[PDB]
Amino acid sequence: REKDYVVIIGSANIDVAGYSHESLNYADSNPGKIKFTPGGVGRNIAQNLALLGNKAWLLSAVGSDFYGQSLLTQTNQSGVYVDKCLIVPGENTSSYLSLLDNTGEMLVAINDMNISNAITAEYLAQHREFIQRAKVIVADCNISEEALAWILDNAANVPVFVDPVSAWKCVKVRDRLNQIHTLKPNRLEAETLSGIALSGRDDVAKVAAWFHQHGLNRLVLSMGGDGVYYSDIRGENGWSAPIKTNVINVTGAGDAMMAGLASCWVDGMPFAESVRFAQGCSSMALSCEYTNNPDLSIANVISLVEN
Amino acid sequence: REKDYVVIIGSANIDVAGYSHESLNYADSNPGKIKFTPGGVGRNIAQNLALLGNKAWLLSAVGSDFYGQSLLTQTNQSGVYVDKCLIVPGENTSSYLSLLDNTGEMLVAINDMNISNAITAEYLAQHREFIQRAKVIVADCNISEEALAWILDNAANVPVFVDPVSAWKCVKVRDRLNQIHTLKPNRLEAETLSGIALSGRDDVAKVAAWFHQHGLNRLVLSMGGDGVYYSDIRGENGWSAPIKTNVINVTGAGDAMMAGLASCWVDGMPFAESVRFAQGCSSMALSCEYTNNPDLSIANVISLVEN
Ligand SMILES: Cn1cc([C@@H]2O[C@H](CO)[C@@H](O)[C@H]2O)c(=O)[nH]c1=O
Ligand SMILES: Cn1cc([C@@H]2O[C@H](CO)[C@@H](O)[C@H]2O)c(=O)[nH]c1=O
Ligand SMILES: [K+]
Ligand SMILES: [K+]
């Protein structure tokens, strides 16, 4: 519907990936390749929602530094509405810098994301009515605990989908599971939140039971080669095997996952079929060089899934 | 004079400096600080010329990638005329990525500068008449040998000041010294060009004699703690001691040097006094965090020099 839109609250980064063509020198500047790409979990999810055909508004923060403007401009080009993003007077725009291998393997990564703290409850409250009229809200855990609490306290019965981002950053959701419609942790995040070891497939039922006892509506638990375990507090649960994928670069798979889950909810799709769809979204991120595959589309995901 | 302008032909980079706050992990992404800054020897010199009060036009190349646009936009903000810069359809904009230490020390550097080869003789010839009406031309040795040869062959009696950039890239000037008005090598560059060891102060006279025998008009030879040796083919030569400087970050000192030399030539200043002025330009770059000190100005350099 032409007035239906989705609101994403999370980080917008410039990802910088550099690798040397040959063996590193340290004692010299080495000819290599350097790529600047848009990143940040929330920004990536928003771009994926746009590619999936939703009107997606990003609520985020960048500095005033020209490169922050390029970030916002490029994310607009892919379909995202960036007009409510906060510009932070004279601040570095967040970035995530990785040194990769001559063969594409990670070495060391620096992340500089303090301006995520500029995504305050005060900022979000300036868009209260807009947020409260979205079809769904996606929040990432890069934002502060106070900002996440504000979203969950003021969602006004709009479902909030939460991306835990990392084992470090996920813990702010632990006491607010009863306010979250859908949570999408990996194995380490679910172990970290629950305090229960996930040693194998046999352990997911007791971990899911812990999440539901603490009030979580829906769990979408990614278990790597084991596939995805999904669980609804009303009783439905199940496993979905992974989709055989030729993996090109792993970055952005979970951001595509989350977009697929939220897009399918907005489109009226049932839970289990939404999890399988989102697995196909992630598969298209996995088979692409960039962290957002610009061939992400409803049509392209369905064809992948039918295989 | 309101129609006097200077033309700079060289590289425009995004410099990316990242350091971890603490000891590196490799096995993790480390919280740290990441800074994006305009760079590239030719772009830096142009910005310094603008700060020194000259109308400076940059002839350079960036890709179409939003971040290339931010580069050009920011360089305009400091006074540089960027309207003739070549945009390269769908190309990475050049970058220079350094991993710095928790204490500011260099570790490893990647440079990605192949689009410097887009600064072709064909491109430059589209601005032949404009180039041939500049008061002075500054070229860096990031550009190809064919492009440098084009500039030196078509300068039409406009003086060409050449920045050798590095020991690797300087060698393209060796056979064209008789076409260069002023060359500004450091000790390793002058050793590399001449084939003569510069073991100490006692060796500069024979190295300068080699440059003049091969047709170089003016040599400005930086010898580190020994200061600067200058030499004119017509017979004047001398040493200028370094200016005591509280060094904050070494990047951009030579770019300020070159700007001071070319600015002083355009302003009518004699050779020896122009070398001492340019030493003060470099001193202000050295005492600044960024690779271009935005307090660079004629007034601020003179006051530094009188001390
Ligand atoms: C270490 N890190 C990384 C990110 C981003 O994740 C995306 C891939 O999903 C990349 O584009 C990064 O910019 C983040 O948002 N928060 C965080 O802590
Ligand atoms: C390794 N390297 C570095 C540069 C630039 O030098 C400036 C400082 O003077 C920095 O801004 C770099 O971007 C260059 O132009 N050509 C080259 O080969
Ligand atoms: K990818
Ligand atoms: K500096």
* Domain extents in chain B: 6-306
Q: Which helix (H) or strand (E) holds B138?
A: strand B136-140
CA gap A49, A7 in Å, rounded: 10
CB contact set of B28 (below 8 Å; sequence gap of 6+): A109
Q: Which residues sit opposite B97 in a β-bridge?
A: B16, B110
Structure tokens that stand for B110 in this block: 């990647």
Chain B, residues 72-131, CB within 8 A of chain A, namely 73-74, 92-93, 95-99, 107-113
Task: Assess contact for B11 and B42: CB atoms under 8 A.
Answer: yes
Q: In 10 A of CB B196, how many CB atoms?
A: 17
Q: Which residues sit opposite B61 in a β-bridge?
A: B86
CA distances from A83 to A57, A75, A118, B166, B238 (A): 8, 11, 16, 44, 60
Query: Nearest by CB to A30, which of B16, B70, B109?
Result: B109
Residue A85, sorted as left (phi over 0), alpha (psi -120 to 50) or beta, turns out to be beta
B40 CA → ligand 2 middle, Å: 5
CA gap A218, A208 in Å, rounded: 9
For residue B111, the chain A residue with the least C-alpha distance is: A31
Rg (CA), chain B: 19
Calculate how close chain B gets to A305, using CA atoms only, in Å: 32
CB contact under 8 A, B99 and A108: yes
- List of chain A residues whose C-beta atoms are within 8 Å of the C-beta of residue B32: 97, 110-112
Structure tokens that stand for A3 in this block: 């007035």
- Whether the CB of B28 is below 8 Å from some CB of chain A: the reply is yes
Backbone CA torsion sign across A226, B28, A261, A270: positive
**Backbone φ, ψ for residue B38 (5° rounding):** -70, 140
Task: Assess contact for A62 and A88: CB atoms under 8 A.
Answer: yes
CB contact set of B91 (below 8 Å; sequence gap of 6+): B63, B64, B65, B115, B118
CA gap A53, A290 in Å, rounded: 19
| Three-state secondary structure call for residue B12 | coil
Q: Which helix (H) or strand (E) holds B46?
A: helix B41-51
Structure tokens that stand for A184 in this block: 């999408």
Task: Assess contact for A151 and A9: CB atoms under 8 A.
Answer: yes
What number does the ligand 1 atom closest to the CA of A37 have?
11
Calculate how close chain A gets to B115, using CA atoms only, in Å: 11
Any idea what DSSP says for residue B170? G
**String of b and e for B226-251 (b: at least 16 CB within 10 Å)?**
bbbbbbbbeeebeebebbebeeebeb
Q: Which residues sit opposite B182 in a β-bridge?
A: B161, B218
Backbone CA torsion sign across A23, A25, A26, A28: negative
Structure tokens that stand for B39 in this block: 């760079």
Task: Assess contact for B212 and B221: CB atoms under 8 A.
Answer: no
Chain A, residues 30-69, CB within 8 A of chain B, namely 30-36, 65-67, 69
What beta strand segments (E) does B164-227 contain? 182-183, 218-222
Any idea what DSSP says for residue B139? E
- In Å, the largest CA–CA distance within chain A is 61
How was this entry determined? X-ray
CA gap B47, B94 in Å, rounded: 17
The DSSP secondary structure of chain A, one letter per residue, reads -TT--EEEE---EEEEEEEESSS--SSSEEEEEEEEEEE-HHHHHHHHHHHTT--EEEE-EEESSSHHHHHHHHHHHTT-B-TTPEEETT-PPPEEEEEEPTTS-EEEEEEE-GGGGGS-HHHHHTTHHHHTTSSEEEEETTS-HHHHHHHHHS-TT--EEEE--STTGGGGGGGGGGG-SEE--BHHHHHHHH-----SGGGHHHHHHHHHHTT-SEEEEE-GGG-EEEEETTS-EEEEPPPP---S--TTHHHHHHHHHHHHHHTT--HHHHHHHHHHHHHHHHTSSSSS-TT--HHHHHHHHH-
CA gap B295, B284 in Å, rounded: 8
| Three-state secondary structure call for residue B163 | strand
Residue A20 exposure: Cα atoms within 13 Å on the Cβ side = 14
**Considering only CA atoms, which of A184, A186, A147, A160 is closest in space to residue A7?**
A160
Q: Which of B66, B76, B106 to mutate to test the interface with A (most CBs of A within 10 A)?
A: B66
Calculate how close chain A gets to B36, using CA atoms only, in Å: 8
**String of b and e for B67-102 (b: at least 16 CB within 10 Å)?**
bbbbbbebbbebbbbbebbbbbeebbbbbbbbbbee
CA gap A8, A79 in Å, rounded: 13
Q: Which helix (H) or strand (E) holds B211?
A: helix B204-213
3-state helix, strand, coil in chain B (%, to 5): 40, 25, 35
Total residues found in chain B within this entry: 307
Total residues found in chain A within this entry: 307
Query: Nearest by CB to A70, which of B24, B70, B96?
Result: B70
Structure tokens that stand for B144 in this block: 């190809």
Residue B81 exposure: Cα atoms within 13 Å on the Cβ side = 11
CA gap A115, B298 in Å, rounded: 37
CA gap A10, A44 in Å, rounded: 9
Structure tokens that stand for A194 in this block: 């629950």
Backbone CA torsion sign across A120, A126, A128, A130: negative
CA gap A111, A125 in Å, rounded: 28
**Considering only CA atoms, which of B55, B116, B52, B47 is closest in space to residue B75?**
B47
Query: Nearest by CB to A66, which of B16, B20, B74?
Result: B74
**Considering only CA atoms, which of A103, A64, A104 is closest in space to residue A85?**
A64
CA gap B170, A107 in Å, rounded: 33
| Three-state secondary structure call for residue B292 | coil
CB contact set of B130 (below 8 Å; sequence gap of 6+): B7, B57, B84
* The residue to which tokens 């049932």 are assigned: A270
Domain A6-306 = CATH 3.30.450.20: no
**String of b and e for A266-298 (b: at least 16 CB within 10 Å)?**
beebebeebbbbbbbbbbbbbbbebbbbeebeb
Backbone CA torsion sign across A286, A291, A293, A296: positive
| Three-state secondary structure call for residue B29 | strand
Task: Assess contact for A33 and A18: CB atoms under 8 A.
Answer: yes
CA gap B61, B58 in Å, rounded: 9
**Considering only CA atoms, which of B283, B291, B288, B286 is closest in space to residue B303?**
B283
CA distances from A14 to A11, A96, A192, A289 (A): 10, 6, 28, 16
Q: Which of A29, A73, A99, A102 to mutate to test the interface with B (most CBs of B within 10 A)?
A: A29
Any idea what DSSP says for residue B199? -
CA gap A173, A176 in Å, rounded: 5
| Three-state secondary structure call for residue B274 | helix
Residues with CB under 5 A from ligand 3 (ion): A 249, 251-252, 288
